[PDB]
Amino acid sequence: TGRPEWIWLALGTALMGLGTLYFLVKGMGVSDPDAKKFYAITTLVPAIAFTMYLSMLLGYGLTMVPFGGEQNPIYWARYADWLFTTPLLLLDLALLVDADQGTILALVGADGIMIGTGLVGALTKVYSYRFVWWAISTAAMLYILYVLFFGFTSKAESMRPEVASTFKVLRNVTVVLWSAYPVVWLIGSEGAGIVPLNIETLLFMVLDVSAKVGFGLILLRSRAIFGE
Amino acid sequence: TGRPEWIWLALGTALMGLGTLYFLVKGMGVSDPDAKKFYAITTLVPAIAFTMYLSMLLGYGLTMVPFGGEQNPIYWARYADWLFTTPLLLLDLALLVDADQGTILALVGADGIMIGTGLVGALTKVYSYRFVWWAISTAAMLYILYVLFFGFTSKAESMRPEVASTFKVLRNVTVVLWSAYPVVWLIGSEGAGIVPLNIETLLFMVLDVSAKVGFGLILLRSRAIFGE
Amino acid sequence: TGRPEWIWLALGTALMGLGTLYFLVKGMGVSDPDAKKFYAITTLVPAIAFTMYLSMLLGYGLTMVPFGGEQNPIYWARYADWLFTTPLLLLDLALLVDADQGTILALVGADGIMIGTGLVGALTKVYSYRFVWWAISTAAMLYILYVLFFGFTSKAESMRPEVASTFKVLRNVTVVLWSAYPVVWLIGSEGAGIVPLNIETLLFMVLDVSAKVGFGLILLRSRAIFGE
Ligand SMILES: *C\C=C(C)/C=C/C=C(C)/C=C/C1=C(C)CCCC1(C)C
Ligand SMILES: *C\C=C(C)/C=C/C=C(C)/C=C/C1=C(C)CCCC1(C)C
Ligand SMILES: *C\C=C(C)/C=C/C=C(C)/C=C/C1=C(C)CCCC1(C)C
């Protein structure tokens, strides 16, 4: 519970906060309208995660959920972070390839379902039911990945070269990191409990920084964000 | 409480889920940008309701509220469904007639107030106060219906013929179904308690499927969704 | 707690409600597309505050929070009001100067952080931690004010004259009123408790009406809202 994993929470808080400041400073030197959208979106991601990481570190974003026959510590603040940051990350990818509003809404909607059902599963009191919510959330995640490959990948190409390769790298990064979340949830304290909360927190922290800050570094360092 | 009405909840879950899949498959054959917006919006509606129906069926979206001198079972998950699905349905209507952003914001805002105040009323502990919230929510609903007739109906016409007639039918469907919700709430467990929760659940399920799936069928089967 | 301050809550409810109706009637005489956006945004602000003021008056938007060694009455409904009304007010300012989407997202995001962290601080059980959240929220507020002066003020000018002067006055009003909120929070029941809840409620009510209704009056009475 709220002790062993404090170091990963403090490290996560520090890393999000440092990334936010870096992106903020880096973005000061920005005039291009479109480059500005990418900077605004990308800087807000770590800023939000920073606040939620801090809430968990201080104990606010933690709650106890009874199931399986025990009082299980559940960090609900994560979902609070994910509800806003994941759609923003998807927005960066969509703006990059200039997706139509229809596909953007589909991605945002699928993302809301993924995080929402993930939260319902995290707070469910009937053990077996938790995995039903996990499956539904996972289906929503696969839909998103499908759109990113069969509804996006085919358009980045019909666009500028630099936009295509940058999108391809960010797309690959997203697919790899995002797919790991359901696995961590399944084996950790929220699911089967095969991995202790301490290790679970460490895993999400590494994933969260790589998806928030790592992702932002790649994106904000490319010329794909400027109007040619 | 959480037993007799299980069948309507299970039927509702199944019907939303089937509608979502149908719209998903049907939309695979879609290239037109605008047709895509209508499919994305319309498919997300049943998808959300599906998750909330399931949460109620499993018991997660149910809570007890003390008032009138009793512990009353209240399915709060409904509001959670309504908060997102009603504005999306209004968006379908607005896109159809190509409404201006000003009117869209007014509708979305009025809708948020309608659902929000409806939720406050559902969870209020002072019996008489529940109806004050019901009245305010009902006023917000009338505003929406007013805009749909005196701020929309007059524009669908100044547009394409097929757009006008389709909008007219969907407009009529909406007015009829939506107006029934406050009545059901008033006579059911949330309000006067003249109708038992069992029958109340049945009523909302029939209304919810007709407004979510029935509405989508009419819309997604018309040529009004394509750019001529 | 829920008694002495009832008059300020009732006065606040009445003033928001009257402002909403006034703006609604005033806006009936509106055809211009852009003028419509300003009316829709501006009328929704008092409408939302009206509902939240009423929830506090009736006792629904009030909760008890343990900290410092006492059971402290906290009106959480305020944040619920602020989460939606502050970004809408910022939207009025942004539309006025025709800000780019990038800056709009930055303002909305910073605003969400400001209100969200303010709420976490309001509900925090560890006294000293409450001020950590206050500081973070205050930093987010300063960012917003910075953008309004160094990212907005310089563009209203490169626009129409009437737009510039109206923006300047609304900008000034915002800076003055918004800066007062963190001070009231710090000295009131949410913070140091130097000022009683009764006086705290009075202060927020005066600020809330001036920022919601006062602000709307200035804006909706200017020619800057019309397309020349
Ligand atoms: C903050 C950044 C990212 C990329 C967060 C991503 C989170 C997910 C993709 C979470 C997915 C879940 C699934 C598919 C099912 C179990 C519950 C989760 C919400 C962890
Ligand atoms: C899911 C689809 C629809 C069309 C849901 C509609 C819901 C309403 C129009 C609810 C309205 C309410 C009112 C006017 C007052 C009592 C409380 C309600 C939230 C049920
Ligand atoms: C309803 C209208 C307005 C203008 C409300 C404004 C509210 C704020 C600017 C609140 C700011 C806060 C800060 C900076 C730190 C303490 C907590 C608050 C949420 C009160």
Side-chain angles (χ1 to χ4, degrees), chain B residues 100-103 105 109 113 117 123 129 133 136, chain C residues 36-37 40-41 44 47-48 51 54-55 58 60:
Chain B
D100 57 281
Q101 298 180 180
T103 306
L105 179 153
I113 290 182
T117 56
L123 307 183
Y129 290 175
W133 292 110
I136 291 162
Chain C
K36 292 165 64 178
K37 278 185 294 181
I41 297 174
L44 184 62
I48 295 300
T51 66
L54 176 61
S55 80
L58 303 184
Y60 184 87

mmCIF file with all atom_site columns, all heavy atoms in Angstrom, chain B residues 100-103 105 109 113 117 123 129 133 136, chain C residues 36-37 40-41 44 47-48 51 54-55 58 60:
data_model
loop_
_atom_site.group_PDB
_atom_site.id
_atom_site.type_symbol
_atom_site.label_atom_id
_atom_site.label_alt_id
_atom_site.label_comp_id
_atom_site.label_asym_id
_atom_site.label_entity_id
_atom_site.label_seq_id
_atom_site.pdbx_PDB_ins_code
_atom_site.Cartn_x
_atom_site.Cartn_y
_atom_site.Cartn_z
_atom_site.occupancy
_atom_site.B_iso_or_equiv
_atom_site.pdbx_formal_charge
_atom_site.auth_seq_id
_atom_site.auth_comp_id
_atom_site.auth_asym_id
_atom_site.auth_atom_id
_atom_site.pdbx_PDB_model_num
ATOM 1   N N   . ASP B 1 100 ? -24.755 26.511 -36.852 1.00 0.00 ? 100 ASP B N   1
ATOM 2   C CA  . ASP B 1 100 ? -23.577 27.305 -36.536 1.00 0.00 ? 100 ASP B CA  1
ATOM 3   C C   . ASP B 1 100 ? -23.057 26.874 -35.170 1.00 0.00 ? 100 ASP B C   1
ATOM 4   O O   . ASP B 1 100 ? -23.790 26.291 -34.372 1.00 0.00 ? 100 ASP B O   1
ATOM 5   C CB  . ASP B 1 100 ? -23.917 28.798 -36.513 1.00 0.00 ? 100 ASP B CB  1
ATOM 6   C CG  . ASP B 1 100 ? -25.021 29.131 -35.531 1.00 0.00 ? 100 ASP B CG  1
ATOM 7   O OD1 . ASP B 1 100 ? -26.201 28.898 -35.856 1.00 0.00 ? 100 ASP B OD1 1
ATOM 8   O OD2 . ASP B 1 100 ? -24.708 29.623 -34.426 1.00 0.00 ? 100 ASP B OD2 1
ATOM 9   N N   . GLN B 1 101 ? -21.788 27.164 -34.908 1.00 0.00 ? 101 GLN B N   1
ATOM 10  C CA  . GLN B 1 101 ? -21.161 26.794 -33.649 1.00 0.00 ? 101 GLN B CA  1
ATOM 11  C C   . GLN B 1 101 ? -21.872 27.389 -32.436 1.00 0.00 ? 101 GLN B C   1
ATOM 12  O O   . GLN B 1 101 ? -21.932 26.758 -31.375 1.00 0.00 ? 101 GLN B O   1
ATOM 13  C CB  . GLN B 1 101 ? -19.689 27.218 -33.666 1.00 0.00 ? 101 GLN B CB  1
ATOM 14  C CG  . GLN B 1 101 ? -18.890 26.529 -34.762 1.00 0.00 ? 101 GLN B CG  1
ATOM 15  C CD  . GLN B 1 101 ? -17.429 26.942 -34.797 1.00 0.00 ? 101 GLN B CD  1
ATOM 16  O OE1 . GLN B 1 101 ? -16.662 26.460 -35.633 1.00 0.00 ? 101 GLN B OE1 1
ATOM 17  N NE2 . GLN B 1 101 ? -17.037 27.836 -33.897 1.00 0.00 ? 101 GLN B NE2 1
ATOM 18  N N   . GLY B 1 102 ? -22.409 28.596 -32.598 1.00 0.00 ? 102 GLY B N   1
ATOM 19  C CA  . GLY B 1 102 ? -23.112 29.252 -31.511 1.00 0.00 ? 102 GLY B CA  1
ATOM 20  C C   . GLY B 1 102 ? -24.271 28.422 -30.990 1.00 0.00 ? 102 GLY B C   1
ATOM 21  O O   . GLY B 1 102 ? -24.391 28.192 -29.789 1.00 0.00 ? 102 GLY B O   1
ATOM 22  N N   . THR B 1 103 ? -25.120 27.962 -31.901 1.00 0.00 ? 103 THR B N   1
ATOM 23  C CA  . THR B 1 103 ? -26.277 27.156 -31.537 1.00 0.00 ? 103 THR B CA  1
ATOM 24  C C   . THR B 1 103 ? -25.860 25.780 -31.009 1.00 0.00 ? 103 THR B C   1
ATOM 25  O O   . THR B 1 103 ? -26.522 25.212 -30.144 1.00 0.00 ? 103 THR B O   1
ATOM 26  C CB  . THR B 1 103 ? -27.224 26.965 -32.751 1.00 0.00 ? 103 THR B CB  1
ATOM 27  O OG1 . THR B 1 103 ? -27.573 28.245 -33.297 1.00 0.00 ? 103 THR B OG1 1
ATOM 28  C CG2 . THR B 1 103 ? -28.505 26.261 -32.326 1.00 0.00 ? 103 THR B CG2 1
ATOM 29  N N   . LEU B 1 105 ? -23.148 25.072 -29.262 1.00 0.00 ? 105 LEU B N   1
ATOM 30  C CA  . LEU B 1 105 ? -22.691 25.284 -27.896 1.00 0.00 ? 105 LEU B CA  1
ATOM 31  C C   . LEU B 1 105 ? -23.879 25.485 -26.959 1.00 0.00 ? 105 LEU B C   1
ATOM 32  O O   . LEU B 1 105 ? -23.879 24.999 -25.825 1.00 0.00 ? 105 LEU B O   1
ATOM 33  C CB  . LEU B 1 105 ? -21.749 26.495 -27.835 1.00 0.00 ? 105 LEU B CB  1
ATOM 34  C CG  . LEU B 1 105 ? -21.193 26.851 -26.448 1.00 0.00 ? 105 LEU B CG  1
ATOM 35  C CD1 . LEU B 1 105 ? -19.862 27.564 -26.598 1.00 0.00 ? 105 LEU B CD1 1
ATOM 36  C CD2 . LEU B 1 105 ? -22.188 27.723 -25.682 1.00 0.00 ? 105 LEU B CD2 1
ATOM 37  N N   . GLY B 1 109 ? -24.605 22.983 -23.973 1.00 0.00 ? 109 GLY B N   1
ATOM 38  C CA  . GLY B 1 109 ? -24.640 23.563 -22.640 1.00 0.00 ? 109 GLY B CA  1
ATOM 39  C C   . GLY B 1 109 ? -25.970 23.295 -21.954 1.00 0.00 ? 109 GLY B C   1
ATOM 40  O O   . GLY B 1 109 ? -26.007 22.908 -20.791 1.00 0.00 ? 109 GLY B O   1
ATOM 41  N N   . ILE B 1 113 ? -26.733 20.931 -18.532 1.00 0.00 ? 113 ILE B N   1
ATOM 42  C CA  . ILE B 1 113 ? -27.511 21.382 -17.388 1.00 0.00 ? 113 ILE B CA  1
ATOM 43  C C   . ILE B 1 113 ? -28.658 20.413 -17.117 1.00 0.00 ? 113 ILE B C   1
ATOM 44  O O   . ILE B 1 113 ? -28.905 20.038 -15.970 1.00 0.00 ? 113 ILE B O   1
ATOM 45  C CB  . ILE B 1 113 ? -28.069 22.802 -17.618 1.00 0.00 ? 113 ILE B CB  1
ATOM 46  C CG1 . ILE B 1 113 ? -26.919 23.810 -17.584 1.00 0.00 ? 113 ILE B CG1 1
ATOM 47  C CG2 . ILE B 1 113 ? -29.131 23.128 -16.564 1.00 0.00 ? 113 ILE B CG2 1
ATOM 48  C CD1 . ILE B 1 113 ? -27.357 25.265 -17.754 1.00 0.00 ? 113 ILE B CD1 1
ATOM 49  N N   . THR B 1 117 ? -28.523 18.556 -13.576 1.00 0.00 ? 117 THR B N   1
ATOM 50  C CA  . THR B 1 117 ? -29.557 18.831 -12.591 1.00 0.00 ? 117 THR B CA  1
ATOM 51  C C   . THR B 1 117 ? -30.421 17.590 -12.359 1.00 0.00 ? 117 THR B C   1
ATOM 52  O O   . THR B 1 117 ? -30.935 17.381 -11.262 1.00 0.00 ? 117 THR B O   1
ATOM 53  C CB  . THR B 1 117 ? -30.441 20.055 -12.995 1.00 0.00 ? 117 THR B CB  1
ATOM 54  O OG1 . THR B 1 117 ? -31.006 19.856 -14.294 1.00 0.00 ? 117 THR B OG1 1
ATOM 55  C CG2 . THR B 1 117 ? -29.596 21.330 -13.002 1.00 0.00 ? 117 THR B CG2 1
ATOM 56  N N   . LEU B 1 123 ? -30.022 12.230 -6.591  1.00 0.00 ? 123 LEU B N   1
ATOM 57  C CA  . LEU B 1 123 ? -29.261 11.983 -5.373  1.00 0.00 ? 123 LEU B CA  1
ATOM 58  C C   . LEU B 1 123 ? -29.613 12.879 -4.187  1.00 0.00 ? 123 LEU B C   1
ATOM 59  O O   . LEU B 1 123 ? -28.991 12.789 -3.127  1.00 0.00 ? 123 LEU B O   1
ATOM 60  C CB  . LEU B 1 123 ? -27.766 12.117 -5.687  1.00 0.00 ? 123 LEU B CB  1
ATOM 61  C CG  . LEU B 1 123 ? -27.286 11.266 -6.869  1.00 0.00 ? 123 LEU B CG  1
ATOM 62  C CD1 . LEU B 1 123 ? -25.781 11.419 -7.042  1.00 0.00 ? 123 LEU B CD1 1
ATOM 63  C CD2 . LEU B 1 123 ? -27.650 9.806  -6.629  1.00 0.00 ? 123 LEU B CD2 1
ATOM 64  N N   . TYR B 1 129 ? -37.208 18.722 -2.471  1.00 0.00 ? 129 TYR B N   1
ATOM 65  C CA  . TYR B 1 129 ? -36.151 19.359 -3.271  1.00 0.00 ? 129 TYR B CA  1
ATOM 66  C C   . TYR B 1 129 ? -35.890 18.639 -4.592  1.00 0.00 ? 129 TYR B C   1
ATOM 67  O O   . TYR B 1 129 ? -35.484 19.259 -5.581  1.00 0.00 ? 129 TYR B O   1
ATOM 68  C CB  . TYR B 1 129 ? -34.841 19.428 -2.474  1.00 0.00 ? 129 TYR B CB  1
ATOM 69  C CG  . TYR B 1 129 ? -34.863 20.410 -1.323  1.00 0.00 ? 129 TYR B CG  1
ATOM 70  C CD1 . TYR B 1 129 ? -33.785 20.503 -0.441  1.00 0.00 ? 129 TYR B CD1 1
ATOM 71  C CD2 . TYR B 1 129 ? -35.953 21.260 -1.124  1.00 0.00 ? 129 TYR B CD2 1
ATOM 72  C CE1 . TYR B 1 129 ? -33.792 21.422 0.610   1.00 0.00 ? 129 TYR B CE1 1
ATOM 73  C CE2 . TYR B 1 129 ? -35.971 22.178 -0.082  1.00 0.00 ? 129 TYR B CE2 1
ATOM 74  C CZ  . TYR B 1 129 ? -34.889 22.254 0.780   1.00 0.00 ? 129 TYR B CZ  1
ATOM 75  O OH  . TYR B 1 129 ? -34.909 23.164 1.803   1.00 0.00 ? 129 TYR B OH  1
ATOM 76  N N   . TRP B 1 133 ? -35.256 20.240 -8.696  1.00 0.00 ? 133 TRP B N   1
ATOM 77  C CA  . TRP B 1 133 ? -34.232 19.896 -9.679  1.00 0.00 ? 133 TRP B CA  1
ATOM 78  C C   . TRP B 1 133 ? -34.885 19.334 -10.946 1.00 0.00 ? 133 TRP B C   1
ATOM 79  O O   . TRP B 1 133 ? -34.430 19.602 -12.061 1.00 0.00 ? 133 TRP B O   1
ATOM 80  C CB  . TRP B 1 133 ? -33.232 18.895 -9.074  1.00 0.00 ? 133 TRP B CB  1
ATOM 81  C CG  . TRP B 1 133 ? -32.390 19.522 -7.984  1.00 0.00 ? 133 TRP B CG  1
ATOM 82  C CD1 . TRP B 1 133 ? -32.448 19.266 -6.640  1.00 0.00 ? 133 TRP B CD1 1
ATOM 83  C CD2 . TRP B 1 133 ? -31.427 20.575 -8.149  1.00 0.00 ? 133 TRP B CD2 1
ATOM 84  N NE1 . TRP B 1 133 ? -31.588 20.097 -5.958  1.00 0.00 ? 133 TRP B NE1 1
ATOM 85  C CE2 . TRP B 1 133 ? -30.948 20.913 -6.858  1.00 0.00 ? 133 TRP B CE2 1
ATOM 86  C CE3 . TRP B 1 133 ? -30.922 21.268 -9.263  1.00 0.00 ? 133 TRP B CE3 1
ATOM 87  C CZ2 . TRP B 1 133 ? -29.989 21.918 -6.651  1.00 0.00 ? 133 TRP B CZ2 1
ATOM 88  C CZ3 . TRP B 1 133 ? -29.962 22.268 -9.053  1.00 0.00 ? 133 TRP B CZ3 1
ATOM 89  C CH2 . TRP B 1 133 ? -29.508 22.579 -7.755  1.00 0.00 ? 133 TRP B CH2 1
ATOM 90  N N   . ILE B 1 136 ? -36.132 22.339 -13.055 1.00 0.00 ? 136 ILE B N   1
ATOM 91  C CA  . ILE B 1 136 ? -35.028 23.022 -13.720 1.00 0.00 ? 136 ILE B CA  1
ATOM 92  C C   . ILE B 1 136 ? -34.522 22.202 -14.911 1.00 0.00 ? 136 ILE B C   1
ATOM 93  O O   . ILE B 1 136 ? -34.272 22.747 -15.988 1.00 0.00 ? 136 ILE B O   1
ATOM 94  C CB  . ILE B 1 136 ? -33.853 23.263 -12.746 1.00 0.00 ? 136 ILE B CB  1
ATOM 95  C CG1 . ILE B 1 136 ? -34.255 24.299 -11.685 1.00 0.00 ? 136 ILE B CG1 1
ATOM 96  C CG2 . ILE B 1 136 ? -32.625 23.736 -13.515 1.00 0.00 ? 136 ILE B CG2 1
ATOM 97  C CD1 . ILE B 1 136 ? -33.355 24.279 -10.469 1.00 0.00 ? 136 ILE B CD1 1
ATOM 98  N N   . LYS C 1 36  ? -23.843 35.477 -32.020 1.00 0.00 ? 36  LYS C N   1
ATOM 99  C CA  . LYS C 1 36  ? -24.521 34.328 -31.438 1.00 0.00 ? 36  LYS C CA  1
ATOM 100 C C   . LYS C 1 36  ? -23.590 33.490 -30.567 1.00 0.00 ? 36  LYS C C   1
ATOM 101 O O   . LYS C 1 36  ? -24.000 33.003 -29.515 1.00 0.00 ? 36  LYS C O   1
ATOM 102 C CB  . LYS C 1 36  ? -25.123 33.459 -32.549 1.00 0.00 ? 36  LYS C CB  1
ATOM 103 C CG  . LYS C 1 36  ? -26.274 34.129 -33.289 1.00 0.00 ? 36  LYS C CG  1
ATOM 104 C CD  . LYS C 1 36  ? -26.616 33.421 -34.593 1.00 0.00 ? 36  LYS C CD  1
ATOM 105 C CE  . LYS C 1 36  ? -27.128 32.010 -34.360 1.00 0.00 ? 36  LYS C CE  1
ATOM 106 N NZ  . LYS C 1 36  ? -27.493 31.343 -35.641 1.00 0.00 ? 36  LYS C NZ  1
ATOM 107 N N   . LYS C 1 37  ? -22.346 33.308 -31.005 1.00 0.00 ? 37  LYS C N   1
ATOM 108 C CA  . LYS C 1 37  ? -21.381 32.538 -30.224 1.00 0.00 ? 37  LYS C CA  1
ATOM 109 C C   . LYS C 1 37  ? -21.148 33.209 -28.878 1.00 0.00 ? 37  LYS C C   1
ATOM 110 O O   . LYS C 1 37  ? -21.147 32.551 -27.834 1.00 0.00 ? 37  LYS C O   1
ATOM 111 C CB  . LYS C 1 37  ? -20.044 32.415 -30.964 1.00 0.00 ? 37  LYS C CB  1
ATOM 112 C CG  . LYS C 1 37  ? -20.006 31.321 -32.016 1.00 0.00 ? 37  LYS C CG  1
ATOM 113 C CD  . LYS C 1 37  ? -18.620 31.171 -32.622 1.00 0.00 ? 37  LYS C CD  1
ATOM 114 C CE  . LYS C 1 37  ? -18.222 32.404 -33.421 1.00 0.00 ? 37  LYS C CE  1
ATOM 115 N NZ  . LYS C 1 37  ? -16.871 32.259 -34.034 1.00 0.00 ? 37  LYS C NZ  1
ATOM 116 N N   . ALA C 1 40  ? -24.235 32.751 -26.652 1.00 0.00 ? 40  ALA C N   1
ATOM 117 C CA  . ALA C 1 40  ? -24.370 31.375 -26.188 1.00 0.00 ? 40  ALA C CA  1
ATOM 118 C C   . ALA C 1 40  ? -23.378 31.093 -25.059 1.00 0.00 ? 40  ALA C C   1
ATOM 119 O O   . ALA C 1 40  ? -23.739 30.541 -24.019 1.00 0.00 ? 40  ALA C O   1
ATOM 120 C CB  . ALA C 1 40  ? -24.138 30.415 -27.343 1.00 0.00 ? 40  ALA C CB  1
ATOM 121 N N   . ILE C 1 41  ? -22.124 31.479 -25.274 1.00 0.00 ? 41  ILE C N   1
ATOM 122 C CA  . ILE C 1 41  ? -21.078 31.287 -24.275 1.00 0.00 ? 41  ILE C CA  1
ATOM 123 C C   . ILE C 1 41  ? -21.406 32.041 -22.994 1.00 0.00 ? 41  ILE C C   1
ATOM 124 O O   . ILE C 1 41  ? -21.428 31.470 -21.905 1.00 0.00 ? 41  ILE C O   1
ATOM 125 C CB  . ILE C 1 41  ? -19.710 31.818 -24.770 1.00 0.00 ? 41  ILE C CB  1
ATOM 126 C CG1 . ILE C 1 41  ? -19.253 31.041 -26.004 1.00 0.00 ? 41  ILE C CG1 1
ATOM 127 C CG2 . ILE C 1 41  ? -18.670 31.727 -23.650 1.00 0.00 ? 41  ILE C CG2 1
ATOM 128 C CD1 . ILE C 1 41  ? -17.979 31.607 -26.619 1.00 0.00 ? 41  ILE C CD1 1
ATOM 129 N N   . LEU C 1 44  ? -24.538 30.845 -20.883 1.00 0.00 ? 44  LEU C N   1
ATOM 130 C CA  . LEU C 1 44  ? -24.309 29.553 -20.231 1.00 0.00 ? 44  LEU C CA  1
ATOM 131 C C   . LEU C 1 44  ? -23.556 29.676 -18.909 1.00 0.00 ? 44  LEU C C   1
ATOM 132 O O   . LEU C 1 44  ? -23.748 28.856 -18.004 1.00 0.00 ? 44  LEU C O   1
ATOM 133 C CB  . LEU C 1 44  ? -23.533 28.616 -21.177 1.00 0.00 ? 44  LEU C CB  1
ATOM 134 C CG  . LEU C 1 44  ? -23.274 27.171 -20.713 1.00 0.00 ? 44  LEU C CG  1
ATOM 135 C CD1 . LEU C 1 44  ? -24.604 26.437 -20.510 1.00 0.00 ? 44  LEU C CD1 1
ATOM 136 C CD2 . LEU C 1 44  ? -22.425 26.438 -21.755 1.00 0.00 ? 44  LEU C CD2 1
ATOM 137 N N   . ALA C 1 47  ? -25.906 30.563 -16.072 1.00 0.00 ? 47  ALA C N   1
ATOM 138 C CA  . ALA C 1 47  ? -26.857 29.454 -15.985 1.00 0.00 ? 47  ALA C CA  1
ATOM 139 C C   . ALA C 1 47  ? -26.267 28.318 -15.145 1.00 0.00 ? 47  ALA C C   1
ATOM 140 O O   . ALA C 1 47  ? -26.942 27.761 -14.273 1.00 0.00 ? 47  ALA C O   1
ATOM 141 C CB  . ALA C 1 47  ? -27.215 28.957 -17.376 1.00 0.00 ? 47  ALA C CB  1
ATOM 142 N N   . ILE C 1 48  ? -25.003 27.996 -15.406 1.00 0.00 ? 48  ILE C N   1
ATOM 143 C CA  . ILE C 1 48  ? -24.291 26.950 -14.669 1.00 0.00 ? 48  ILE C CA  1
ATOM 144 C C   . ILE C 1 48  ? -24.112 27.377 -13.214 1.00 0.00 ? 48  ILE C C   1
ATOM 145 O O   . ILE C 1 48  ? -24.436 26.623 -12.292 1.00 0.00 ? 48  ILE C O   1
ATOM 146 C CB  . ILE C 1 48  ? -22.877 26.691 -15.259 1.00 0.00 ? 48  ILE C CB  1
ATOM 147 C CG1 . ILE C 1 48  ? -22.989 26.139 -16.683 1.00 0.00 ? 48  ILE C CG1 1
ATOM 148 C CG2 . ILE C 1 48  ? -22.078 25.745 -14.340 1.00 0.00 ? 48  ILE C CG2 1
ATOM 149 C CD1 . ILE C 1 48  ? -23.727 24.844 -16.783 1.00 0.00 ? 48  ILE C CD1 1
ATOM 150 N N   . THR C 1 51  ? -27.180 27.015 -11.086 1.00 0.00 ? 51  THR C N   1
ATOM 151 C CA  . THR C 1 51  ? -27.452 25.674 -10.586 1.00 0.00 ? 51  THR C CA  1
ATOM 152 C C   . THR C 1 51  ? -26.558 25.277 -9.410  1.00 0.00 ? 51  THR C C   1
ATOM 153 O O   . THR C 1 51  ? -27.016 24.631 -8.473  1.00 0.00 ? 51  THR C O   1
ATOM 154 C CB  . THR C 1 51  ? -27.299 24.598 -11.688 1.00 0.00 ? 51  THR C CB  1
ATOM 155 O OG1 . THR C 1 51  ? -25.931 24.527 -12.099 1.00 0.00 ? 51  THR C OG1 1
ATOM 156 C CG2 . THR C 1 51  ? -28.196 24.910 -12.879 1.00 0.00 ? 51  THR C CG2 1
ATOM 157 N N   . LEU C 1 54  ? -27.477 27.217 -6.276  1.00 0.00 ? 54  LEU C N   1
ATOM 158 C CA  . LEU C 1 54  ? -28.680 26.618 -5.704  1.00 0.00 ? 54  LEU C CA  1
ATOM 159 C C   . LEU C 1 54  ? -28.338 25.325 -4.961  1.00 0.00 ? 54  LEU C C   1
ATOM 160 O O   . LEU C 1 54  ? -28.888 25.061 -3.893  1.00 0.00 ? 54  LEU C O   1
ATOM 161 C CB  . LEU C 1 54  ? -29.730 26.322 -6.787  1.00 0.00 ? 54  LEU C CB  1
ATOM 162 C CG  . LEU C 1 54  ? -31.004 25.597 -6.310  1.00 0.00 ? 54  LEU C CG  1
ATOM 163 C CD1 . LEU C 1 54  ? -31.768 26.432 -5.250  1.00 0.00 ? 54  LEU C CD1 1
ATOM 164 C CD2 . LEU C 1 54  ? -31.896 25.339 -7.510  1.00 0.00 ? 54  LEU C CD2 1
ATOM 165 N N   . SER C 1 55  ? -27.435 24.521 -5.520  1.00 0.00 ? 55  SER C N   1
ATOM 166 C CA  . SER C 1 55  ? -27.052 23.270 -4.868  1.00 0.00 ? 55  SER C CA  1
ATOM 167 C C   . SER C 1 55  ? -26.420 23.557 -3.512  1.00 0.00 ? 55  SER C C   1
ATOM 168 O O   . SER C 1 55  ? -26.609 22.795 -2.563  1.00 0.00 ? 55  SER C O   1
ATOM 169 C CB  . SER C 1 55  ? -26.076 22.460 -5.737  1.00 0.00 ? 55  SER C CB  1
ATOM 170 O OG  . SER C 1 55  ? -24.745 22.943 -5.642  1.00 0.00 ? 55  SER C OG  1
ATOM 171 N N   . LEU C 1 58  ? -29.231 24.748 -1.024  1.00 0.00 ? 58  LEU C N   1
ATOM 172 C CA  . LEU C 1 58  ? -30.031 23.612 -0.567  1.00 0.00 ? 58  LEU C CA  1
ATOM 173 C C   . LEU C 1 58  ? -29.228 22.601 0.244   1.00 0.00 ? 58  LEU C C   1
ATOM 174 O O   . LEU C 1 58  ? -29.795 21.658 0.807   1.00 0.00 ? 58  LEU C O   1
ATOM 175 C CB  . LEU C 1 58  ? -30.691 22.902 -1.758  1.00 0.00 ? 58  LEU C CB  1
ATOM 176 C CG  . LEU C 1 58  ? -31.587 23.771 -2.648  1.00 0.00 ? 58  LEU C CG  1
ATOM 177 C CD1 . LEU C 1 58  ? -32.253 22.915 -3.731  1.00 0.00 ? 58  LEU C CD1 1
ATOM 178 C CD2 . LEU C 1 58  ? -32.632 24.455 -1.792  1.00 0.00 ? 58  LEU C CD2 1
ATOM 179 N N   . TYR C 1 60  ? -26.788 20.547 -0.961  1.00 0.00 ? 60  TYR C N   1
ATOM 180 C CA  . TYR C 1 60  ? -26.222 19.436 -1.726  1.00 0.00 ? 60  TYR C CA  1
ATOM 181 C C   . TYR C 1 60  ? -24.727 19.602 -2.043  1.00 0.00 ? 60  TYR C C   1
ATOM 182 O O   . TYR C 1 60  ? -23.948 18.654 -1.910  1.00 0.00 ? 60  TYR C O   1
ATOM 183 C CB  . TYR C 1 60  ? -27.016 19.224 -3.027  1.00 0.00 ? 60  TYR C CB  1
ATOM 184 C CG  . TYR C 1 60  ? -26.543 18.030 -3.829  1.00 0.00 ? 60  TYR C CG  1
ATOM 185 C CD1 . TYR C 1 60  ? -27.054 16.755 -3.576  1.00 0.00 ? 60  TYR C CD1 1
ATOM 186 C CD2 . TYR C 1 60  ? -25.517 18.155 -4.777  1.00 0.00 ? 60  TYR C CD2 1
ATOM 187 C CE1 . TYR C 1 60  ? -26.551 15.630 -4.230  1.00 0.00 ? 60  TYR C CE1 1
ATOM 188 C CE2 . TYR C 1 60  ? -25.005 17.035 -5.443  1.00 0.00 ? 60  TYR C CE2 1
ATOM 189 C CZ  . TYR C 1 60  ? -25.525 15.776 -5.158  1.00 0.00 ? 60  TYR C CZ  1
ATOM 190 O OH  . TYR C 1 60  ? -24.998 14.660 -5.765  1.00 0.00 ? 60  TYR C OH  1
#
